[PDB]
Amino acid sequence: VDDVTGEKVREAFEQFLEDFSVQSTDTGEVEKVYRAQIEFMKIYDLNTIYIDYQHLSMRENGALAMAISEQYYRFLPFLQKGLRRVVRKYAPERVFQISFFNLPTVHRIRDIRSEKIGSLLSISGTVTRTSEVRPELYKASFTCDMCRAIVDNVEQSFKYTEPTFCPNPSCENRAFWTLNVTRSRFLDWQKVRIQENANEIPTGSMPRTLDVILRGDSVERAKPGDRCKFTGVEIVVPDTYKISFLACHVISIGRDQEVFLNSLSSDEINELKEMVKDEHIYDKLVRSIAPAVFGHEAVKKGILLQMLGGVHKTVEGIKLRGDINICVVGDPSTSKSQFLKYVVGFAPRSVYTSGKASSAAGLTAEAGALMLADNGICCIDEFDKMDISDQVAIHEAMEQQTISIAKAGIHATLNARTSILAAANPVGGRYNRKLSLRGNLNMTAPIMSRFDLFFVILDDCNEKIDTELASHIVDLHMKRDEAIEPPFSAEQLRRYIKYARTFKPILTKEARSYLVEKYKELRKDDAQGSRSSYRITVRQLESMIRLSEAIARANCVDEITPSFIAEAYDLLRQSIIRVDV
Amino acid sequence: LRVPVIDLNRVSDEEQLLPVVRAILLQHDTFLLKNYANKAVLDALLAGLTTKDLPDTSQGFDANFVWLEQYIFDTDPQLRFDRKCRNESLCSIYSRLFKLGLFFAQLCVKSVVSSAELQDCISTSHYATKLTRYFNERDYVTFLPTGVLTIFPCAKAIRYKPSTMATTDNSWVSIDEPDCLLFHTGTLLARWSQGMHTTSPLQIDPRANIVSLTIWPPLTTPISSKGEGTIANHLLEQQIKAFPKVAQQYYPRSILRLQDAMKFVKELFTVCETVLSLNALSRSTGVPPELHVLLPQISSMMKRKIVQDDILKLLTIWSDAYVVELNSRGELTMNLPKRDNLTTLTNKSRTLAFVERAESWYQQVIASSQRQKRYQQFLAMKMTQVFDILFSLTRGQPYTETYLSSLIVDSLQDSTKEASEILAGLQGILPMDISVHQVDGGLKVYRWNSLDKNRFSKLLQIHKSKQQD
Amino acid sequence: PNVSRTIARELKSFLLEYTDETGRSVYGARIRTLGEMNSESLEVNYRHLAESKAILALFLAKCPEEMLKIFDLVAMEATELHYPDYARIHSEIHVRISDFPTIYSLRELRESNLSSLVRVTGVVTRRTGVFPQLKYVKFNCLKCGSILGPFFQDSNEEIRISFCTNCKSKGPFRVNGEKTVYRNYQRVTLQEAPGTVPPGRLPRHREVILLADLVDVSKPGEEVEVTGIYKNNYDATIIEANSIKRREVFSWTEEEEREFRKISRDRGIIDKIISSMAPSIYGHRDIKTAVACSLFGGVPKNVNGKHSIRGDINVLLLGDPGTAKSQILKYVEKTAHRAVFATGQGASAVGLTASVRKDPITKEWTLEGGALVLADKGVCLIDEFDKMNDQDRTSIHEAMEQQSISISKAGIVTTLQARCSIIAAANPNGGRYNSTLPLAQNVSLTEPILSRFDILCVVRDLVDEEADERLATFVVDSHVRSSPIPQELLMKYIHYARTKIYPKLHQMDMDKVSRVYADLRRESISTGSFPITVRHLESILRIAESFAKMRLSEFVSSYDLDRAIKVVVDSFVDAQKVSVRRQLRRSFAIY
């Protein structure tokens, strides 16, 4: 009866998928659908399935969806069974994996409860510490030679033993074993211990990771140090048991239809469209970056731009890197970057790497280093503390941000894209004055050559200025009242940032002509007679490109103007003449 | 791959080494002979090899297109076939090795029955001596001896073609023996010994210089009982004729045997039948025979390149043979004929049938930014979207109660102001499922987890405030 | 079941009765052959087998597994009949069969592929040391006394040994060194052959196990073929290889090639190609020229029987900071069939120094090659030799000298043969142009190593107006994006000519070369040291021969001579200190 009720469910479901999965008419996407799925599978005949919750919940009024959700553990067998039924029905070595998707909600890790056990669930999270894939039993063939062996089933929960009953025979038993490696179902498990999403963390209870085992083709779909969404299949492991969720559907979710950003944004979407209308704010923007600092503006800018774009992609060869690494050299802290970086703590994908003594646990086996800052700066303090180990890292880092790993557990290159917010002290304190920056900076060897920009910081008191910052600080120190408020609202900023990414600048000819003259002058001008610092290599111009990309990005136009160009070259010229010491 | 060595002076008595040579020709076939009466004269004979000025008539260099050539010299006594040049040393070594072959038959044929028969094979001495050259080496295509016996001086030149014979590993074998002269057994002699013999080829080697003597049975001698219908002259003239050889030798320029195109196609059909059988009936029980898979297996087997065009000549040949269906992608699956299990009897018959049809064909030959405002209205519409997403945000989260913040955040993450606003509007529309209770500590959400989301769906549909607000 | 009882018989018949090709039971010949060779491993043309009996070879296809067990036994009996006393020695003989395309590649395999015999080929990666098989695991426990008896586990699980012996806990189990059977056999990492990898897809290491005679036969850095039976064993997919075949998506096509030859007729296709080589950099005709050249090839070429000389070109690309000196090699990396980018050190794998070491934690200990053996007959791509540890440096010199990599450790002692051509980007010590002083002065690396490098590509220059123009234009043009051969055409092309053509000089007119050699040598002694060497002369030869391969010329021609001469000539010129200016006056005749 329970057998029958659940079977009624089975038949119902088979009817469902069998029933037209699609009402989309005319231009379409006209029916079926799922049959189509089945076929396309048969095209590749890879023997696992993915399906959308949504349609299903919809169809039955979801009374089905309900029963499914709830009893899902119970329900699995009837399900895959009916699957086998229709496959046999319409199709011609049997392994089936079915994956729902398009679940309506998302559950937090801490949100987990014992009531939800054994029902499918929805969790997204931050991946940690993946594990090599190891075969499984699914069903194992093990029995004694008496009288007959390798009965195929179970070892289900990690035990892994053993043949359960009706041994031997007739040696009837007990006994034990014997396992046929000839007959069983391997799978998978790579398992993974995933961590709750950072932003979420309620103060101060602090993060709690959980483990999930990747079975089936969902295996390897994962990437460490990644936000990813999973379908619950939740349940438990003994320990006394400890719940551990499982994953059918591995989604790495977590651009753009800039609309769908707007649509997504929609509520403000009214508001700052004004900002788009608005002007100058390239100032006000600039008039907002690091309110902390007096002057320090060329930086404030630089950070801002660094946040901005400049595009992946050639396909000749290198996808043209959009990213821009910023170097800022200075006489030491009191703000070092002791100020600027920390400030830069506020941002997405934001990796504040205090010091360079880590040692590259960054990229350990998450790029703490990097893959976490993918599409973000690793604000890596005191590269100096890199000593001699990280220069190795700069390579791939500056290269593909591939992450090469072979511990021989696997040989795996993990690509990355992460902005470089970087830093080091000068050799002897502020040495840069007479001393040439190169070699006054020293350490980064060729990776040095990988740096697009540099702002050299030295402090000479205009007790005017000295006084100024002094006041600034003081007021700040005065808890109140600080009217230090950015020309543009900061939240507003971050939002806008979202906007700017959306734009993808052109343009052509315009500036290309104008620029070409510019570099050539920049260029020649730079070279002759005397010269501040090297070189200027054209990779400068490469920067110039990137730079422009930031400037137009500010314009959002999205197209290039010799104006924007000139600006780039200007700030550029600034940094180089800076190199004159 | 044993390579025995014996002096012919010890073969001279013929009562000590006679069975041994038969024992090794039963194994190694081709034998390594050494130190005959000719020694330095063999090197002195090289002076007459530079001639290369003669036509064919089974004599003179054979220029064949290209670099390869065979200076064949027909024996002098036969009437009205002669072209003489210089090569007198060759005429000397002709007799010198005439004794060597007359004795070789005594160390070979005499080992079986009597030597009284072999003298009849040597007495006419009609065999043509053969000098051989290459122009200033892949030039050697695999080849089998023309006469029943071929003695020859050599350096290396020799390989071993793949086969089941001596050294069944069937990789090429190049032996180089100083102060030695290798012998090669003839093809027809294998029939004469009824299967006791073997043949071996040549290969790519730096020394182009080669020399041979094919000592050959008389024009008038039958070969056993089986060759009463085929004399040695007939069969052995057959293969030496073809060969090209080349333009002036097409005389004759028709056997039930292939114009070779046919025989090759036969081989193909063999391999094909084999592999299609293999994937079809084997590889999977349900590996469908796609032409690209195909091309690999026999292209391999053949080691030759199979073209789809070749297949069309095959179906052209046996059309009943295989079904073939161009699928989309344009690839053509081939289908065997209609009877699931193709036994080896099957395809034996098929091979036969094809053979019949071909030989039939041979008979036939023989017989013939306001974008903003857009976003504003769009969001106005997305109200409804939110209802549908919230409705059933509860339902695809099998809870229907919750932390208002939480789901607020998930749905938010789908697309906060807009989010909370929707929270409000829904509350207003459905002040039944939803209650908001401010308590000391804050406003608690209240949500009726049992409320009916279908009715709520239609109600949300109808009361947007009827979309009038 | 016992059904097969009939079968084995028939097989033994086929074995016995078989021959072909003037008979000669090749089966019998095999048997008697080993025989006293006492090799205990049988090998069988699947051609013959299939040929004789399909259902046989089929039974191989599906469930080879037991099938062989069936096979080997009757084989053994047969041998005993051949050799009566053979029963005592080795007691068993395992058939390797032969030939089963298929040839499932590497990357292409499915579960459908599992458990069934599969043929494949590929490059030997790190491959395990040897340890005796006989696998058994067991539990001495703690509280429950012992011995819990032997278990056989697992490839590879060793799990989980749940409950036994009193208890089963808490006196729970600890394996003992005493009484646990081990294996070593053959463990081999094999990854997909780099020549054939499809673009953007990375070649996949797959797991190979070797046992019995198979063990240790192979050397890493070698594409070999193996006939395996794909096993999900166990406990992850393990290829169980019956066979090993020594070496032995883009390929030339008849229509394609026939077409191609026509292209090859024109002379200027050289330049057009040189043009085709590195579109993006805008480069230097010369720098490109070298590149193309070494890329193209040379002739090996064995002088019987002693020394083969060298058919290869070690291209020293002497760069300069921010020269694309980086980029260029990447181009070829894209380009070449079998190509190995080893970078400097540190490392971008491979480590260029072959070593056999313990695998990640627990697996049989796998002997792997440096990039060289990997790139044997392929190409070795590396930069920042100044960044190379001497530990490597010795390796490099060694190969360059011997062209073969000997390895004595740990127990394994071998010499792999890396045929790769050397392509190198380097950094003039510090400054772009270190000095007017000769380059050897102007750069760090040791001259002995250097002399090994034939092709020295030096980079320049002082700022130049129009130069800055043309370039900056080029670049700008590029970034703005957001006559030479179609690359792919070229890409097959090199592979093709490399395959087909073997140019050969005619000594007749070639002697003039010698005259040249002197005209150089003497006048060259006057200024600069040395560098001139007969080795350098040989280089000239090998080079022009490359040009002939470019010409697809099969024999040598004065044009290609002019090419090479100009090339090597200029290279030498460029090497010298500024006094080379004086030298320039005489290169006119050389021009």
Q: What subunits touch chain B, counting only 3 or more CB pairs under 8 A?
A: A, C
Q: Which residues contact B73 (CB under 8 A, 6 or more apart)?
A: B59, B60, B87, B90, B128, B129, B130, B131
Closest CA to B137 of B158, B113, B119, B151: B158
Strand pairing of A49-52 and A98-101? parallel
Residue B320, H or E segment: none
- Count of CA atoms in the C-beta half-sphere (13 A) of C421: 32
For chain B, what percentages of helix, strand and coil (3-state, to nearest 5) are there? 40, 15, 50
Distance from CA of C491 to the nearest CA of A (A): 15
- Residue B362: strand, helix, or coil: helix
**What are the residues whose beta carbons fall under 8 Å from the beta carbon of C260, sequence distance 6 or more?**
C252, C489, C492, C493, C496
| Number of CB atoms found within 10 A of residue C35's CB | 14
Are the C-beta atoms of residues C583 and C527 closer than 8 Å to each other? Answer: yes
Q: What kind of experiment solved this structure?
A: cryo-EM
Contacts of B336 in chain C (CB under 8 A): none
Buried b (16+ CB within 10 A) or exposed e, A218-252: bbebbbbbbbbbbbbbbbeeeeeeebbbbbbbbbe
Q: Are strands A453-457 and A419-422 parallel, antiparallel or unpaired?
A: unpaired
CA distance B465 to C3: 80
Residue C199 is labelled as binding a ligand: no
- Looking at CA atoms only, how far is residue B112 from chain A in angstroms? 58
In three-state secondary structure terms, A140 is strand
Q: How far apart are CA C529 and CA C515, in angstroms?
A: 21
Rounded to whole angstroms, the Cα distance separating C317 from C325 reads: 8
Q: Any CB–CB contact under 8 A between B394 and chain A?
A: yes
Q: Do C20 and B164 touch (CB under 8 A)?
A: yes
Q: Give the pairing of strands C379-383 and C339-341.
A: parallel
Tokens of residue A344, six digits: 């830069």
* β-bridge partners, C415: C406
Rounded CA separation A5/A18 (Å) = 19
Q: Which CATH class is domain A1-105?
A: alpha beta
Q: How many CA atoms lie within 13 A of A99 on its CB side?
A: 21
Write out residues 470-509 of C within 8 Å (CB-CB) of A: 471-473, 475-482
Provide the CB-side half-sphere exposure for C282 (13 A, CA): 13
Q: Confirm or deny that A337 is annotated as ligand binding.
A: yes
Interface with A, mutate which of C109, C188, C468 (most A CBs under 10 A):
C468
List residues bridging with B129 in a β-sheet: B73, B213
Which two tokens mark A68? 């499914």
Q: Does B356 touch chain A (CB under 8 A)?
A: no
Q: Is the bond preceding residue A102 a cis peptide, omega within 30 degrees?
A: no
d(CA C43, CA A162): 40
* HSE-up (13 A, CA, CB side) for residue C324: 19
Q: Does the CB of C27 have a partner CB in chain B at under 8 Å?
A: yes
3-state secondary structure of B373: helix
The answer, yes or no, to whether the previous bond of C410 is cis (omega within 30 of 0) is yes
Cβ distance B168 to C62 less than 8 Å, yes or no, reads no
Question: Using an 8 Å Cβ cutoff, are A117 and A146 in contact?
Answer: no
C272 torsion bin: left (phi>0), alpha (psi -120 to 50), beta (else): alpha
* Residue B30 CA: distances (Å) to CA of A316, A391, B3, B16: 61, 69, 10, 20
Kindly tell me the number of DSSP H helices and DSSP E strands found in chain C.
21, 18
Check if A66 contacts B (Cβ < 8 Å).
yes
CA-nearest of B98, B96, B102, B104 to B6 is B104
Sign, CA dihedral B312-B314-B320-B324, equals: negative
B440-469 burial, b for 16+ CB within 10 Å, e for fewer? eeeeebebeeeeebeebeebbeebbeeeee
* Domain residue spans of chain A: 1-105, 106-134+188-254, 135-187, 266-581
Cα–Cα distance for residue pair C87/A192, rounded to 1 Å: 53
**Alpha-carbon distance A81 to B397, whole Å?**
26
Give CATH superfamily name and number for C249-591.
P-loop containing nucleotide triphosphate hydrolases (3.40.50.300)
Decide if C244 contacts C124 (C-beta within 8 A).
no
**What are phi and psi for residue B381, nearest 5 degrees?**
-65, -40
Closest-CA residue of A relative to B452 is: A61
Q: How many angstroms separate the Cα of A134 from the Cα of each of A129, A220, A439, A512, C202?
A: 15, 11, 51, 55, 22
Query: In angstroms, rounded to a whole number, what is the distance separating the alpha carbons of residues C32 and C28?
Result: 6
First to last CA, chain B: 101
* DSSP one-letter code for C66: H
Segment (H or E) for B197: none
**Chain B contact for C434 (CB, 8 A cutoff):** no
Helix (H/G/I), strand (E/B), else coil: B337: coil
For the beta sheet containing C339-341, the strands, ordered from the edge strand earlier in sequence to the opposite edge, are C339-341, C379-383, C421-426, C315-318, C455-457
User: Are C168 and C192 spatial neighbours (Cβ–Cβ below 8 Å)?
Assistant: no
The answer to whether the annotation marks A242 as part of a ligand binding site is no
Q: What is the DSSP letter of A367?
A: B
Per DSSP, the three-state class of B70 is strand
Residue B127 backbone phi and psi in degrees, to 5: -65, 140
- Interatomic CA distance for residues C347 and C334, integer angstroms: 20
Maximal C-alpha separation, chain A? 102
In total, chain B counts a number of residues equal to 469
C532-545 burial, b at 16+ Cβ within 10 Å, e below that, comes to: beeebbebbbbbbb
The domain made up of C1-102 has a fold known as: mini-chromosome maintenance (MCM) complex, chain A, domain 1 (3.30.1640)
Helix axes A34-44, A63-90, angle to 10 degrees: 50
Which residues touch A17 (CB under 8 Å, ≥6 apart)? Answer: A34, A51, A86
Give the Cβ contact number of residue B141 at 10 Å.
Answer: 8
Per CB distance under 8 Å, which residues of B are interface residues toward C?
A: 161-170, 190, 195, 197-199, 206, 274, 277-278, 281-284, 296-297, 300-301, 305, 343-344
Instruction: Count each helix (H run) and each strand (E run) in chain A, helices first.
Output: 16, 17
Pairwise CB contact (< 8 Å): A263 & B379: yes
Domain ranges of chain C: 1-102, 103-134+182-248, 135-181, 249-591
CB A407, CB A365: distance < 8 Å: yes
User: Rounded to whole angstroms, how far apart are CA atoms B54 and B69?
Assistant: 11
What is the residue type of B2?
Answer: R
- Cβ proximity of B26 and B185 under 8 Å: no
What fold characterizes domain A106-134+188-254? OB fold (Dihydrolipoamide Acetyltransferase, E2P) (2.40.50)
Read off the tokens for A509: 């000819």
User: What are the two backbone dihedrals, phi and then psi, of residue B11, each rounded to the nearest 5 degrees?
Assistant: -85, -15
Strand ranges for C211-341 from DSSP E: 223-231, 238-241, 315-318, 339-341
Cα–Cα distances in angstroms (integers) from residue B355 to residues B263, B270, B317, B359, C50, in the given order: 9, 11, 9, 6, 21
Cβ(C418)–Cβ(C309) below 8 Å: no
Element (H, E) at C422: strand C421-426
Tell me the C-alpha distance between A358 and B464, whole Å: 57
| 3-state SS, residue B252 | coil
Contact between chains at A538 and C472 (C-beta distance less than 8 A):
yes
* Residue C502, amino acid: Y
The total of other beta-carbon atoms located within 10 Å of residue C71's CB is: 26
- Residue B53: which H helix or E strand, with range? none
Chain A residues within 8 A of B406 when measuring between CB atoms = 107-108, 111
Structure token pair of residue A351: 């990796």
Tokens representing B462 are 């109808």
Q: Are A502 and A258 in contact (CB under 8 A)?
A: yes
Q: Decide: helix, strand or coil at residue B385.
A: helix
Contacts of A280 (CB under 8 A, 6+ apart): none
Closest CA of chain A from C141, distance in Å: 17
Structure tokens, C182: 């081990």
* C324 appears as a binding residue in the annotation: yes
Nearest in space to A500 (alpha carbons), one of A459, A446, A554: A554
C476/A516 touch (CB, cutoff 8 Å), yes or no = yes
Task: Tell me the torsion sign for CA atoms A440, A441, A445, A448.
Answer: negative
Cα–Cα distance measured from residue A345 to residue B361, given in angstroms and rounded to the nearest whole number: 87
At B199, the amino acid letter reads T
Q: Do the Cβ atoms of B415 and A268 come within 8 Å?
A: no
Rounded Cα gap, residues B8 and B104, in angstroms: 10
- Nearest by CB to residue C160, choosing from A158, A446, A527, is A158
Amino acid at C504: K
Nearest 10 degrees: Cα torsion B454, B455, B456, B459: 130
> HSE-up of B253 (CA within 13 Å, CB side)?
3
Nearest CA to B317 among B367, B267, B255, B277? Answer: B267
Q: Give rounded-to-5 percent helix, strand, coil for chain C.
A: 40, 15, 45
CA neighbor of A48 nearest in space, from A156, A188, A193: A188
What are the backbone angles phi and psi of residue A14, rounded to the nearest 5°? -45, -50
Tokens in use for A557?
């136009």
Q: At what angle do helices C487-500 and C534-551 cross, to 10 degrees?
A: 120
Query: Cα–Cα distances in Å, from B301 out to A149, A531, B316, C217?
Result: 41, 71, 22, 27
Q: Cα(C391)–Cα(A123) distance, rounded to whole angstroms?
A: 50
B454 vs A61: CB contact, 8 Å cut-off?
yes
Angle between helix axes A562-578 and A539-555 (nearest 10 degrees) is: 130
| Nearest in space to A10 (alpha carbons), one of A100, A80, A91, A88 | A80
Instruction: Tell me the chain B residues in contact with residue C33 when contact means C-beta distances shorter than 8 Å.
Output: 168-169
Q: What is the resolution of this structure in A?
A: 7.1
CB B426, CB B408: distance < 8 Å: no
Report CA B3 to chain centroid distance, whole Å: 31
Q: Look up tokens 């917010």; give the residue.
A: A421
CA distance A131 to A118: 24
DSSP conformation letters of B278-307: HIIIII-TT---BHHHHHHHHHHHHSSPP-
Look-up of token digits 């036939």 = B364
Exposure on the CB side of residue A133, measured as CA atoms within 13 A: 18
Chain C residue nearest residue B28, CA to CA: C24
**What are the structure tokens assigned to C491, written together?**
């890409």
A505, exposed or middle or buried, with CB in 10 Å at 0-12, 13-18, 19+?
buried
Euclidean distance between CA atoms A146 and A166, whole angstroms:
11
Rg (CA), chain B: 43
Per-state percent for chain A, helix, strand, coil, to nearest 5: 35, 15, 50
Beta strands, E only, A189-338 = 190-195, 209-214, 227-231, 236-238, 241-243, 246-247, 250-251, 326-330
Name, in order, each residue with C-beta under 8 angstroms of A479's C-beta and a sequence gap of 6 or more: none
Task: Please name the member of B286, B375, B395 whose beta carbon is closest to the beta carbon of A92.
Answer: B286
Distance from C-alpha of A195 to C-alpha of B406, rounded to nearest angstrom: 18
**A359 belongs to an annotated ligand binding site:** no
CATH 3.40.50.300 is the classification of domain A266-581: yes
Chains that touch A (3 or more CB pairs under 8 A): B, C
Q: DSSP for A267-309? A: TGGGTTHHHHH--STHHHHHTTS-TTSSS-HHHHHHHHHHHS-
Q: In this structure, what DSSP letter does residue A321 have?
A: P
